[PDB]
């Protein structure tokens, strides 16, 4: 084998957050010199690709839109391939990522985190579409997330609500699903066994990736807490102190 692609988590790994991880920018420059394929990945249901992109550029990361693959991109890919018309239960700010997807006579349900749509009447309409055989596509299933005033419900509980109602599993597109990481390499010409994933979240980043054949590097910044390394078996391929260190390891060890 040989290493041809690198998947880099964004939040926790490159920036943490609205401030860059120290060395991150120069480390990414080192990476681009290595002549390796690079894809920046993340779970989001509310930030468009341009939104993330604008933020990364303000932190002086030089990145293309073609290199960013998020759970929204993944949700959009699935829609094009299945040729379906979604009922879009998503934040308005995610809509630019479904530009061009037809919504008339919906025959699919896409769920992200969308408080304005998460109420009885609209959930029951989604339910009634599911009964009719429409698939349920979950951008991801996080239970909760941390906002200014405490933890708040993520999309995961609402998705789980509809699975329970219909007694069926959603198709989950984001991390840690296997299909996420495989979709991330579509168009790269690269197989997962020729790829490494770098992130701060052991289950969602390393666990998920290692499960498709990728090498997983846990970095100890951002969301990482002490001993997170042993929350998976097998353990991570490598546990580094930060993205820069991960990059240094890739250059001196894996790149042939
Ligand atoms: Cl391909
Ligand atoms: Na992360």
UniProtKB/Swiss-Prot annotation:
One of its GO terms (molecular function) is enzyme binding. Residues 43-67 form a coiled coil. Mg(2+) binds at residues 9, 11, 200. Keywords: Coiled coil, Magnesium, Metal-binding. The keyword Endoplasmic reticulum does not apply. The keyword Coiled coil applies. It comes from the Eukaryota. Binds 1 Mg(2+) ion per subunit. GO terms for cellular component: cytoplasm; extracellular exosome. InterPro entries: HAD-like_sf, HAD-SF_hydro_IIA, HAD_sf, LHPP/HDHD2. Substrate binds at residues 9-11, 42-43, 175. Its cofactor is Mg(2+). The modification N6-succinyllysine is found at residue 46. CDD domains: HAD_PPase (cd07509). Belongs to the HAD-like hydrolase superfamily. This is Haloacid dehalogenase-like hydrolase domain-containing protein 2.
């Amino acid at each position: 084998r040989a290493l041809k692609a690198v998947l880099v988590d964004l939040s926790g790994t490159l920036h943490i957050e609205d401030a860059a991880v120290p060395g991150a920018q120069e480390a990414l420059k080192r990476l681009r010199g290595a002549s390796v394929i690079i894809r920046f990945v993340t779970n989001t249901t509310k930030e468009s690709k341009q939104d993330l992109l604008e933020r990364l550029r303000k932190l002086e990361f030089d990145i293309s839109e073609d290199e960013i693959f998020t759970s929204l991109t993944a949700a959009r890919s699935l829609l094009e391939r299945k040729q379906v018309r979604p009922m879009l239960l998503v934040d308005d700010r995610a809509l630019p990522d479904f530009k061009g997807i037809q919504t008339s006579d919906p025959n699919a349900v896409v769920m992200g985190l969308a408080p304005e749509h998460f109420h009885y009447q609209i959930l029951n309409q989604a339910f009634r579409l599911l009964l009719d055989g429409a698939p349920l596509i979950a951008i991801h299933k996080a239970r909760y997330y941390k906002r200014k005033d405490g933890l708040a419900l993520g999309p995961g509980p609402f998705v789980t609500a509809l699975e329970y109602a219909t007694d069926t599993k959603a198709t989950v597109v984001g991390k840690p699903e296997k299909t996420f990481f495989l979709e991330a390499l579509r168009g790269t010409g690269c197989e997962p066994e020729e790829a490494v994933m770098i992130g701060d979240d052991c289950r969602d980043d390393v666990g998920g990736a290692q499960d498709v054949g990728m090498l997983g590097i846990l970095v100890k910044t951002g969301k990482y807490r002490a001993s997170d390394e042993e929350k998976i078996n097998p353990p991570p391929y490598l546990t580094c102190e930060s993205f820069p260190h991960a990059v240094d390891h890739i250059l001196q060890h894996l790149l042939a």
